[PDB]
Paper text:
The P genotypes are further classified into five genogroups, P[I] to P[V], based on the sequences of the spike protein VP8*, one of the two proteolytic fragments of VP4.
To investigate the structural features of P-VP8*, a recombinant P-VP8* variant (62–232 amino acids) was expressed in E. coli and purified by affinity chromatography with GSH-agarose.
Residue numbers in the entry: 64 to 236
Amino acid sequence: TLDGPYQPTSFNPPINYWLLLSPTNAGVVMQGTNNTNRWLATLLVEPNVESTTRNYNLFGSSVDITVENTSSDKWKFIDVGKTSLNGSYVQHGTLISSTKLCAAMKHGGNLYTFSGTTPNALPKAYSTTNFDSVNVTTFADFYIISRDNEQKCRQYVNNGLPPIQNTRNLEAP
């Protein structure tokens, strides 16, 4: 099989697969909803950004969100979510990254993303509801890595993608 890259698209991902996103610049990286109780997204903020209100298109709506990135050297991924149609988005996990990669996976009713600071970012679970039916729309090129190969996803998120598009076969010893 071919891990990627795949171009921005919308689909409902199966459980037990990581989607590894490779955005180029700040903005919305990906979003997903179950159309019932969760509307979710990951935002990207470049280094060296003082607290500022930015506009993001989430599910077609114009949403103003106050963001900051105090890191001089690393990019900041921000997980955001709301739990009702008219609810406010709030910021949850963050991933402070030199690689500009983030990732999400549905497993066991939970939604996992990477959080922390590279090269020591780790998967962490959101478990406030059953997330199994949440779809995705990606706004960056992305790769698909099975949970059985989670070690490969961890290594890429923390250390970078290979310089060529052969991820199926490229892994550190």
